[PDB]
Every structure is written in C-alpha cells, then in structure tokens.
Amino acid sequence: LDVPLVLFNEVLDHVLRIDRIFRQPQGHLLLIGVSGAGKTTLSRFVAWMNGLSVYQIKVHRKYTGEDFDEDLRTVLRRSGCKNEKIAFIMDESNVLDSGFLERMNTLLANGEVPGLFEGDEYATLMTQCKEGAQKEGLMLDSHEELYKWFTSQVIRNLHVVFTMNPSSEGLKDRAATSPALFNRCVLNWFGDWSTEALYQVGKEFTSKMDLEKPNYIVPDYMPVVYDKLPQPPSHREAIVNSCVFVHQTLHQANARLAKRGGRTMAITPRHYLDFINHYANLFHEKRSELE
Amino acid sequence: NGLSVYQIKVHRKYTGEDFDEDLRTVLRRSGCKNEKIAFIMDESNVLD
Amino acid sequence: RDPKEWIPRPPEKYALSGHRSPVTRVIFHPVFSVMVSASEDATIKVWDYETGDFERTLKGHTDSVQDISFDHSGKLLASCSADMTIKLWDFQGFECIRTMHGHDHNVSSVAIMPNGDHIVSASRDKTIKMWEVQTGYCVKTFTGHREWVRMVRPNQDGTLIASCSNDQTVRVWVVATKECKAELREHEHVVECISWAPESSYSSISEATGSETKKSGKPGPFLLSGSRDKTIKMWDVSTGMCLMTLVGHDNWVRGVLFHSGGKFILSCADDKTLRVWDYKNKRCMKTLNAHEHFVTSLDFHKTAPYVVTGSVDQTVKVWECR
Amino acid sequence: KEWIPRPPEKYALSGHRSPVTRVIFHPVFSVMVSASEDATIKVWDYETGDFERTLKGHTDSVQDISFDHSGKLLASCSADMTIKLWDFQGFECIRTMHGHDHNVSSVAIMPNGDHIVSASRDKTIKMWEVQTGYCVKTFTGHREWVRMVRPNQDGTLIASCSNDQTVRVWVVATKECKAELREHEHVVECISWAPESSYSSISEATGSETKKSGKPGPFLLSGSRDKTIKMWDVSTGMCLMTLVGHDNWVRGVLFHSGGKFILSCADDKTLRVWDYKNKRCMKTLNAHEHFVTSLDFHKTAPYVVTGSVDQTVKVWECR
Amino acid sequence: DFQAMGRIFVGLCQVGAWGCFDEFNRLEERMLSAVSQQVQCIQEALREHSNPNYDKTSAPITCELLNKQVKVSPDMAIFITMNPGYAGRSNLPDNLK
Amino acid sequence: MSIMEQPLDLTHIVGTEVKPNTPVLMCSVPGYDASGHVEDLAAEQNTQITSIAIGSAEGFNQADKAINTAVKSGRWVMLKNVHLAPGWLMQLEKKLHSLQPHACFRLFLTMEINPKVPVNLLRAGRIFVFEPPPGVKANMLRTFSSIPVSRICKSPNERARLYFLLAWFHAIIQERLRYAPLGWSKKYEFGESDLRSACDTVDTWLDDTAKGRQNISPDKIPWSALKTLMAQSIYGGRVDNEFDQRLLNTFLERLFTTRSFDSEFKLACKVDGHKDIQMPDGIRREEFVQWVELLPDTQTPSWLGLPNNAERVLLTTQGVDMISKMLKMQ
Amino acid sequence: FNRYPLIIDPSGQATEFIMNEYKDRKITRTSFLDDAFRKNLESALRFGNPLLVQDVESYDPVLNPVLNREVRRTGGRVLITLGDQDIDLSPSFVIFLSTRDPTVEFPPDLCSRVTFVNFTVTRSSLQSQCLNEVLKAERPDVDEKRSDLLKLQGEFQLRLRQLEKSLLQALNEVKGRILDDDTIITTLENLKREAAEVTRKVEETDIVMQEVETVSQQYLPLSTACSSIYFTMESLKQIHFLYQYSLQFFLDIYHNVLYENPNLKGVTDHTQRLSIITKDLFQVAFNRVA
C-alpha cells in the first residue's frame, strides 16, 4: 500500500493492540471508530508484519447472500486446506443482509459454518482436506475427523477484523444480532482522533513549512485548545493549535446544525488531513508566487 | 472443421496426475458434451 | 411483376464500390429509398439504390464495423464495431449521438427492438447485452452461451431474441425474464446467421412442412439458422424441432432471410453465389454468381423489388427482380 | 451535371513543407493524393480532410503522379531521374525505374493498365512496362523540354507538350507524330483530352462538320503561358476556339465530368470556370494567396481539389 | 397474489359463478390495488354487456384478463366480505372501494 | 383567495401550465381519489389514456411500456396508488428527468398523502391536493361542475330541482364530517361514489315514473323510493350506528318531500337566529347554480343544523396551529 | 480538491459546468445505475480520462480503492486493484460524483471518502437572476446592451492583464540595457500605447454601465420580492412534508407572470406594467402553490 501515514502516540498503541490479537489463536478484532481513522489501513499494515493475507469482500450493488457464501467458502478453503494466514477484514457497510451476520456469528464462535459446504463442494472440500492433512504428516481418512482437522486449522489460521462506526443504537442492536461479536471478539474503541492526536498530526505534517516568526507576540489570553500546549508557545505551535481549533469548530457546527433540524455530514479525520494538505500546498504556492 | 483444439500446458511440475486430469477434462467435453475436440500434443509433452 | 413473388436476376443493376475494406453488412432504409452498408474500414457508407449514387460516409468508429440496423421509423441507425463500442446515429443529421461501451471484446451484432426504445447486441465475450435508447444504459445481459456469439435477432413483436454462437448452438431467449426458451442445436459446425419468419409465411410454412393446424391458431415462431456446414435449417421455436434442412450451398452460409411475400428463402454463402430456395419442395431454383469473392450478407426490400448483397471484394451490388 | 465550385471553401489542407506540384483523385476510394516538391507524396481523405499517410520514397521533388483504371497502382515521377511505382494496398514502393535522363516532368498510365509513359528535360518520351520495368520504345522528335504528357481513353494515342511550342500527338503502334501543332504564342504547359460525354457538345458549339464516318474525331486541349487556352482537333489539326482572359500563365486544365464547362487554373492566383458553349459562365474564383499549381475534377463526387505553391491544398464544393 | 386473483376471476367469468372473498382485506395493500384493475375491467365488460343494443348473435362480450381475451358471463358477480375493526389488516385503496 | 374555493380547472392547468416532462402528482386525503377526474378530463379532451394500478411486478412492466409508448405517441398515462412502491418511484423520477417526450404527453400519478413518498419525486412534478371542499358553497360548486349539464337537463323539468336537493343533501352530510363527535359518531366515508350512486338512482326512478313527459306532478315523484334507497343502500350502507341512521333518516325526510317544491320551503332554520336559507324558485340548472354562487361567504354550523358553538374549539385550535406554523418558518 | 469531489446540484447547472471545463479532455458521463459502469470505470482509469458519475445514492463500493487512492507503485507504474484485476492508474485520471437530491443521506464512510460541494441557491444570486429576467422581458434593448458591455469589459480587463504581464515580461528579458536594442523600445511603446485606448475604452464602457444600472434600479424591488417569495416556498417544507418545491417551479411562475400575463396585453407604460407584474406575481404564486 503506497499511502503516506502520519504516526503519533495513539497509532503506536493501536498497532500493538492489533498485533497482540493476531498472534493469538482464534483472534478476532472489533474495531470501533469514525470512518477514515485508519482502522483498515492499520490492520493491513499489521497483517503484513505478521504474515497475514488481507481479504476483503468486493461488495457491489448486485451482491447477494450467495456471493457472500462463495467468498466465505474461498476464505475457509485457503485458511483451512491451504494453511494460509488470513486476516479477514470486513466493514459493517458490507453487511447487506441479516444473513451475513448469521453466517459470521457461527463462524466467529465455532470456527466453521455447518451449512456452508454441501453436495459437490463438500466433496471437493473433503478431498482438498485429504492432501491438505498429508502435508503436515497426518494420516486421516474418514470424513468426520477430516472436518475436525479443517475446523482446527481454520481456528488457528483465520483471523477476522470487523470495523464499524460508533453508533449507540447500532451497538445495542449488534449486541443481540451477533452475540459472538461481543464474546469472541476483542473490542477496541479507536473512536475519533483526540485533541493530542490532531495536534501531533499537525505538528508533524506542517514541520516542512517554515511557520517561523521570531517577532511573534504571545497574547495575554491564549485560546488554548490543546491542553499540553507549551505555556510560551512558538509561532508554529500557535498555528497547529489553530488547526486543531478549526477541526473542532466543525464538530460544534454539526451539533448546532443537527439540533436545529438540518442535515449534517459527519466530520472525519480525513477532513483534517485534507485541511493540512491544502494548508501545505497553499502556503508553498502563495510563497512561491509572492517571491 | 469445427474441432475444438486442446493442448496440454505442461511445465516442470507436470506429473502423471496432471495428465490424468487433463484426460478427464477432454473426455468429459468430447464424450458427455458431444463436443468435437482435436487433441493436439507433442512428443515433448510426453514427460513420462 | 407479381407483388409477392419477384426473385433476383443475373443481370445486376448497380455495382457500387467505394469501400476500402470488405463489406460486412448491407441493409435497406425502411422508409426512404436509400441504402446503408457497413464495411471493415470503420466506415458506414450510404448509397441510393434507385440511381446508384454515393451520398455520404458515416465515420467515427475506430475499427471495423460489424453490424448495422434501423429502427421501425428509420430515424435511428444502430452500428456496432470491433472496437468494443456501439454507436447510435441520428440519421437526419448523420452524427453520432451516443456511444455505448461495456462489451469486453469484439461486438459482432446489434439490433433495435421493434418498440424502438431498446437495443440488443451480441459480442465475443459470450454475452448478449441490452441497452436503452434514451439513456444508453445497459439494463440486461443474456449469459449462457459457451462461445463467441455471432448474431442476435429479435422476433416481430420483440418478446423473443434469438442468438447464434460459435458453440454450434442457437438459443432463443425471452426478453421479459431472460430465460432460455430453447437451445436449438443440430448444426455440426459453427452457426453464422439467423432469421425469423415474417407474418405472411406462417401459413406457407405450416402447409409446406405438413404440420397440422393448431387449435390456438398460431403455428408458432419459426427460425432459420444458416451455418458453416453448408446447410440451412428451419426450426420451430415452440417445439424445438428442425422442420427441414436445406442443402446445396458449396461453402459457409453467411446470410439467410425470407422473401417479403413469405414464398421463398434468400440465402448467400461464401461459394460466391446467392441462392433462392423453395421451402415448399425443399430445393433451389436459381443460383446467382453474385460476386467474384465471398458474399458476406444480403438484404431484401420490404416493398420495392430490390436485393442488395455485400461481399469481401469491396463491392455492393443491387439486383433487379423480375 | 452542373457541378460548379463556389467561393466558400470546405477544407484547407496544409501539411506539405514544400510547394505542391499536383493533386489527383482516387478512381474508386474516397482518397485525394497530393504531390509536392519535398520528395513526399501525401494522402488525404477529401470528404473529411484528414491527413492519412505519406510516401517518402522519392529523392528529389516529385513532379507528377497518376493512378490506373482500377486505382490499384500509383505511378510517380520526380526530379531524381526515376519513375517509382507504388502499391496502393500497402503503400510501399514496389519497383524503382531508372533511365530517362535528367528531371522527369510527367508520368501517366494508359487505360490498358500495363504500360507507363513519361516525359523529361531530355526532349523525349519513354514508354515502359509496369510488370517488368524495361523501356521497350522511346519517342523522339521534341527539340526541347517536354512538360506534360497524357494518353487517350484506350491506350492508342498520346499527346505531349513541350517548351518548343509544339504539341505532338503520337501513336502506340506506328510511333509517329500523326499531328504536329506549332502555333502557341508562348510555352505550352498543360494538356488534357476530351471524354466521350463532350464530343456531342463540341459539334454545334463550333460548327464543325462531321466526316464520312460521322465521328467528330479525337479532341485535344492545350494550355500555354501566353494566357490563352486553345482546344484542338486531333484528327484534323486546326483550331476551333481560343479562350482568353487569364492574367498570368496557366498551369492546369481539364474538362468538367459533364463535358459542358471548362475549369482551369493559372498563375493569376485565381481559378477560372469558363463556358465554351455560349461564353456565358466566366466565373473567376480566388483560390490561393500564391500561385496555383494544379487542379482536378472528381468523376462523380461534386468535389474539386487544387494545389498551390503556398504549401496548401484546398477542396471546393461543387454546386 | 395478482396472478391467482386473475386466474380465479377467469374461472368465475367463464363459468358465471358468484365469487365471495371473505377476509378480503387480508391481502397486501399493494396487491389489493393491483386487483382493482381486473375488477374494473370485469365490471366494465358487464356494464357493456347490459346495454339494449347488444345482441347475442354478435361476438360475445370479453374482458382483458391476464393478457388474454376471456368471455364474461352475465350471471357472474364479485362479493368481498371484510372486518375493518381488526388492526393490522390492509386498507383497501380508494379506487378499489 | 377567491380562486381556491372555486372547483379546480384541470383542463386549463394540464393543457398549459404543465410541461410534458413534469409528472402530474395528484395527492388526495383518505376517502378521496383523483382517478375519476382525469378519466372525465381525458374523455372530454378525446385523448386516449392508459390506466395502470401499481402494486404488482407485472404492473411495473406495463407502466414502463405505457410510458415508453406514450412519450412518442403523445398519449396519456395514469398510474394509480404509486405511493405503495416508494422504491420504484425513485427509479421512475430518474427516468423522467432524462426524457424528451411528445408535446401532448402527460403523466398522472394518483396517490394518497403518505410520508413514504420520495422527496425528489415531489420536487420533480406538480402537486395537486384533493380534499373535502372548505364549505357548503364550495361543495355545491364541485357537485354541479362534476355532473354534466346534459345529464341534469333531461325531459322532466323537475330533474334539476331533484339534483339540487341531492346536492344540498350531499353538501350538508359531507360538511358535518368535520365535527366528528357532534356531526356524526365517526368519520364516515361519504364521498363522490355515494353521490354518483344517488344520481343514478334519481335518474332511474324518475324515468320509471315519468315516461318521457315534459313535466310531472311534485307528489307523483317517487319520494319513498328515493328516501328508502338513500337511507338503506346508497348512504345508509356505511352507517353502522342506530342513532346515525336516525340522523340520516331525519335529513332525508326533511328534504326529499313534496314540500321541497314549495316556494317558501326552508333548507335550514335560523342559521343566524333571524335569517334562514330559502329554496330557490328556479326550475332549470342555471338558476340553481346562480343561487349557489350567491350564497353568503359567512358560514356557521347552524347551516348543518348543528349548534353555532360547535366550531369554537376547532377554530381556536386551527388558529393556534397557524401561529405555530408561522413561528416555525420565520 | 484533494479527495475526489461529490457534487450536489438539484438544478443540475453544475453538471454541464464540469462538462464544459473538461470537454477538451474528452470527459465521459456515466451513472451507477448502468450495468456497464465497471467497463467505463476501467477505461477511464487506464487511459486517464475524466469521468462524471451520476446517481451517487446508488454508490458502488467498487470505487473504495479509487477514492481512497489505495495505489501500488512498482516498476515505475501505478497499480490500482479494481475488483480482482490490476489496472495501470494514469495520473491524468479524475472522477466526479454528482446528484440532484439535496436531501439524500450518505453513510459516513462515503462522506469521508469524498469532498462535498453543495450548489445552493443564494438570495443574492436569485435576485440577480430575476432582475436579469425581467430586464430581458420588459427592456430587451437594455438587456442586450448590458450583455454586450459585460463581454466588452471582460476582454478589456483580460487585455490589460496581458499588457501588464507582457510589459514586465519584456523588461525582465533584456540582455543588457533597454536603449541598447531599439526593438525593445518599440515593444514598450506599443504595449504602453495599447493600454491607452483600452483604458479609455474601459472608461467609455463604464459610463454606459452607469446608465444601464440607473435604469435597472426601478426593477430592483421586484427582484427582491422574488427572492423572498422563493425562500418562503422552500421553507414551506417545515410545516408539511408534501410542500416540496424546486427552483424550476418558481421560475415557471416567474416566466408565466412575465410573458403569459393576460393583463399586459394593452399596457405600455413601464411603471404600470411593473405594478401589474408585481401584483400578479403574488397572485400567480399563491394560486399555483395553494
């Protein structure tokens, strides 16, 4: 993945948490946070480090339950028969039906779906488990014990990462629709980027720009937004604090707009990244043309 | 003549089991699907 | 001149030759007395068959044009080329008003529904796609063919579309529900061309084949399928049985169609000949040495007694009928 | 047909880096070919005015080009002392033909489609074989540079014009100057013959009396630098009418496809359409900012193409 | 559904038998509206059958049902029995009522 | 605001003020349908119309074909109860936006006022609201306009008086429904369907009694036939309460009698305590219509026979809501 | 824009603006409802062609790698994993998303992936549109005079900018001293003299604008009233969900009261016509809305 990432304290803590579960058998993640916060990118980065193969279902408008089952069949075959480390990352927007959760609920807890493989595909799966068990040196013949080995392999190999937005009612609804999601999955509350996280991203990204003013006068009443801002702040630190305040202004803007009854669009950390990126380009362009 | 040309894609890992599966594929097409197949193979493809 | 019995004659009327590449198909304008032909030089030249005077060229396609068709009103021309595109032409203005993409390989057929609000096309990606005239959106795809689909043609009412592919099978589909009504496979080789039976020929077909009159009153749609095994077969779509097989072409049959009066069958092949068939007696009357090379297509005017045949020799010919 | 060029133009093609020397129409295809002085032969689609390709096999400035009856082969002559034959299917030089010393001026293919003629400064006309490339016979008798040479409609009679003020008509079988015409005030440059569509129109437009056979006889036309266009009778050799009014030297002349009007180009920077029947149509049309070099008339399509010194080729509608 | 109601109507139209549809509001609201079109066509055929100018020697009166021409017997009638007091039952569309 | 109380002029608006690209959304409150008006509008315009009832998968197919055919032939298309398929309505609006139909093409979407109707469809088309007329005078005008003039002016000259009496009875009964506990016991579905059945009943029995005679005696009119049929089949069918039936019987006997033809007959008694509504003395349709148009603008529940204080709480509530609506949209 | 924009325009005027800007770049219009959307998407990605996709409410999740720029750089090419095949992402590729529903809701992931661009109707813009419309209907000579002058001022101001840029361009490229080469003096004299008449042409155009403006001041109250009526129209949705009215509906009312007004048949006084139009504007709006 050729996408730049700005690292702060929370990212280091988060990736360590993800790495911990991936090294555990039957390790499943439940990442909760605002969209665009890096939940998928962090999981993919950690999955590469641990050798996991990232799998995401390519959902579209015509996607249906059979398409989901086919994708599940492919993942289980690779995870169980081929003994391939798979990190199955799925977003809640990929759940287009309650049947999607029903298959996942059984898979998360039991590690296998009783109704997924039938008929010819069951025979094909049973055959694939035969030479599959041969490579580890296990001599298993009958179908019943072959399924146990396949189930055991999936539990050890397959890891599931589930990411969804922090919806209070959706959390309660999902607490009953998928009980295994709250029992077989480790819940990590990424949430929105904190004030410190926003400050760290701004400090790192705007480091390339000059933002230096030796004759900058510190006002008596500093509009302090970042709590740990240095008491005699520099010109650069004041700029980054203003950048954090701008992002928080939109959050209050939506709350006031939603309270009155208007339509609001959620503000995400990706908006902050666009803000600093526009700041970097405009500063470079205006400085160049003025010179 | 309408014959469907079939050629076995051999490689270094091509073994007897791979050839048998290819034979099963061509026979199924030419025996069950009533498909005329012109099976073309070279002596180099005869590894065993 | 019997108004439902004229047949072409060896003395050609006009020999139009302006194409730089083999002529793919030739069609008649339903209303105006003008002719449209598509060739392999990515050009669609328009000719007048009364005076044999070239009028204009409709360019815009990148690669060879494979099929052209007209709607009922004659105000729109639908052309498909090998560049994976389908272009809709405003015939009065002679400009491309809409270009349609979506096929994954060579497109070898195109036709406008009798209602005139939808376009059907078949390509080399083993799919038959349907498009909207107004929006240009793909709304349906007809899958099931195992090989390159060469031609697609709708029936009179537009409810059924037939298709012939390289899989040596002819499939009849239902537009409303996309289901395969029948799989007509008796040709021993690739099937090239298909054609439906006009409303004036059901009685003649029924009495010629000896089929008993049905209690419903409709004998059922009849389909023709010329293939490369030098045979022409007429099918009963309702029953899926080959009513007859016509033999006598010396090479691959490229086009086949009924006489406008529903009394004879006109078919052209790669044997450099155009043949007129009597399905009453299952035999051929007259053989015309149409061109000096392969004959790619033919068309029969609905009212006027004129027959046009395209060919690989880059020549389009008009035949008087007497 | 009353096809007439109009002052509004359709396309002004300018791709040549050197003055254009001649322009022709493809017999069957919608192709217009122009020859210039940069040793390149360019191919255009006159219907849409799009440059198609170039044929850069020649060494020195290309003088004259010609097609055949079928439009399959293209014959070219240039100042590099050679005749080049082009295969129009693939657009490659398939036979380079030498001899015929010094700058070769004109080249043409008889409607037989088997032999080629050429003219050059060496005061002679050579007849070649397209299949082999060997000059079987040579025409001698011109005492100066032969400028422009055309055959008849059946490959039997050939007329050649030269700087020596003489327009001599030659015969394939006898190789003799059947008619010699030495009457022009200044140098003759361009000649063209009469199609069968115009033989009837000449009889009552000039008062000529039919012979015992009744056929009016072959007809000739010659354009000269003396600003006069004169049409001639091959069978007899006397004048019928002289067309005057060009301001400068004339460079190209030919008959309308309908055989009713006269279209010509001259160094007067303008194209003049003249009527010989009644002297009614004297349309003068400004064509180029510089000298106009050559022109052609499409056999069926209502299009005319003109080449000029200004590196630009123009196409006019006919109405 | 629409097909079953049309097929039942075809049987009633041809036979000429009274059709009593009790609990008629148990159908889906969308499908009650769809049925109304068939009833209107049937009722229109019955009305046109009752005019004095019609003669039995002429063509029999037919109505468009299920994309077919079905003869309509004058003795046939449609009756629906409903209990509107039950909550959850569909509300018949105004055009049907 | 004098235009609104007049009956809607669909002929002028559809022909001129509605573009072919704009669908004609015709919303209606429960108990009212706009389908009948368009069919009458199409009939008098001599324009073919295709009516399709939405709610079935094949119903959508016919809708697509009818719309596709009409936009080229300039015909009319009706789709009733489109509110039952809100998902399909969104698709329909998208198709309509990219469309260049015939100049005479018109699309009518008959639906009830439902919150599930897509917002974009409402903005795309023109909305017409069908609801009970505001007053008795408005209810008369709608009734007279709907009934053809030739239908009223038949051979008996007493037919016009009978139609006017039926119109007054229909106006009084329907208007009382705004007072649910007092005017009746529940919101009965007294609509145009009942009025049409009553009009056909009047025509059938008048023709049966008067055998084409120009004039008939007022007592010879089958008053009992009209009174009983209206109280039992036409209007009394929807009535499930004994006291409501008694109220309906009282109005019928107070109106449909031989005394109604008297010059001094009273429609209502003491509307304002001094004045009372008087029977018009006309014998033709025009005279009755003119009297309707001359009715005073002021209206009280005493016109319906209800006490004058029955509308005090309702008017006060509507006034407060009007203030709230103004204060919500400042 | 950094993230690919999403366009909201109920009137659709922003749609052709995107078309006109990228017309030279052979921009292609498609929609999410088209079954062949994938083929157009791959063609745009491979050949770097601008793409405009409508009906975003049916957003295909296949654009998630494209919107997120989950690109792979290897071997000098840029690879994007669209579905299950790899496509060389040309740097010139750009995609625009458009919709005509201002009230459509979007999932938060889609909101993060795109840059919302809302094309709303403002009071100032509406007043200008109505003022121009009434000017054309009532004083066509003034309206065309204003239209020509706006074109004149635009290419006068553009000419001055070019002259100012060229004057600095010439002075910065002299290899030595100005008087060393006489041709430099010729250019500056031409450039300086060129701005002389353009400045006068601007001045003579400006005074006519004063006359054009002072005659349009009479119609200013009508345009102000039109803005108030239309925004009352839009806010009518607060009291009932059925009172949904688009801008085109108000324009039709404005068009009808201007050209199809029966009360303007024999009236020729401008003040009388304006009063009649204003009075009928309120009447027509109420009649249609109610």
Added chain:
Amino acid sequence: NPLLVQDVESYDPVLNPVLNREVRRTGGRVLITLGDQDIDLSPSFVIFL
C-alpha cells in the same frame, strides 16, 4: 518490463506461447492466451534467455 531468465537448461514449457508470438489482434489490440488467462501483451515487452 524487459525480462532476463537464466538457466535455460531447465526451460519451462510455459514460454511457448510467448516464444511463438501467437497473439491475436482486435478486442484489446494484442491478446496472448497464456495458459488459460487471456493476457494482454505489452508492445514494449521483451525477454532474454
């Protein structure tokens, strides 16, 4: 991506479609049927053994 492949003495009989250049035109310009995948050949591709 010009490619150099060493150790030709262990030649894989999978370059036979590449070596014989049995590509076809139309439907994507040059199309090579490598095994079962209809690979689209790149005109700049070249291989050395």
